[PDB]
Amino acid sequence: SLAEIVKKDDFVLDSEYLVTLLVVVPKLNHNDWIKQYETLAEMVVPRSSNVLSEDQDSYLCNVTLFRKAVDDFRHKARENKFIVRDFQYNEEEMKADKEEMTRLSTDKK
Amino acid sequence: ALSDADVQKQIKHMMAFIEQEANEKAEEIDAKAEEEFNIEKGRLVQTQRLKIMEYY
Amino acid sequence: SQTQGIQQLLQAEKRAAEKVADARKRKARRLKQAKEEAQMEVEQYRREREQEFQSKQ
């Protein structure tokens, strides 16, 4: 779960035709992504090469591209060791689960 | 190499249908306005005509 | 595009919305005009048939 990691500033706001995919890319291919982000799908926003977070297996990053180009991106990117993390961000959608686990522990106590 | 050139290329490809299809939609709204203007000319006041011809 | 290109797309959609709103307002005003003018034509022909009614009398 990505409650504390990805935030609203890391997502396009009021996008008309643009989806910002959370394209996690390992260190084995991070530079390949940062130098191919635009050509990885048709009709991609130029210079939309941003980096957000990381983890033990890979370095999270996201690019902004066309709505119908999400499928093309997945086609051209699944074979590059890239991966897409389709996640929706909200304030209480993320906090309520931690609240529930903590409440579960407290009332269990 | 690409930079603002490919930016504006993407923008123009987007403008080919963001505002142009909107122009077709709204110009056809105007066409509907004129046609249904002619139809309101001859359906409601037409009943009014029928009623006052009935008075006569 | 990260700053200005997306803004251009957004403001172009705003211009499309402006065109749609303008066309809707034009249609509404067109039909109000239709009501008024057709009422006036019916009124004129009503005057004509009133005068012909007096003539018949």
Helix H, strand E, coil C: the string for C7-54 is: HHHHHHHHHHHHHHHHHHHHHHHHHHHHHHHHHHHHHHHHHHHHHHHH
- CB A50, CB C3: distance < 8 Å: no
Q: Which residue of C has its CA nearest to A44?
A: C1
Interface contact flag, C2 A48, Cβ < 8 Å: yes
**Chain C CB contacts of A48 below 8 Å:** 1-2
CA dist., res. C18 & res. C24, Å (int) = 10
- Distance from C-alpha of A94 to C-alpha of A3, rounded to nearest angstrom: 5
- Cα C23 from Cα B26, distance rounded (Å): 5
User: Quick one: residue A43, left, alpha or beta (phi over 0 = left, psi -120 to 50 = alpha)?
Assistant: left
CB contact under 8 A, C5 and B11: yes
- Between CA B45 and CA A29 the distance in angstroms is 73
A21: part of which helix (H) or strand (E)? strand A18-21
Question: Cβ B13–A43 below 8 Å, yes or no?
Answer: yes
**Torsion angles phi and psi, residue A26, rounded to 5:** -65, 170
Token pair 């990117």 is at which residue? A77
Residue B50: strand pairing partners: none
Minimum Cα–Cα distance from A64: chain C residue: C2
Longest dimension (CA), chain A: 54
- Give the span between the Cα atoms of B18 and A106, in whole angstroms: 54
Q: In terms of CA atoms, which chain A residue is nearest residue B1?
A: A46
Of B11, B29, B52, the CB nearest to C9: B11
Q: Cα dihedral sign for A25, A26, A32, A34?
A: positive
Resolution of the coordinates, Å: 4.4
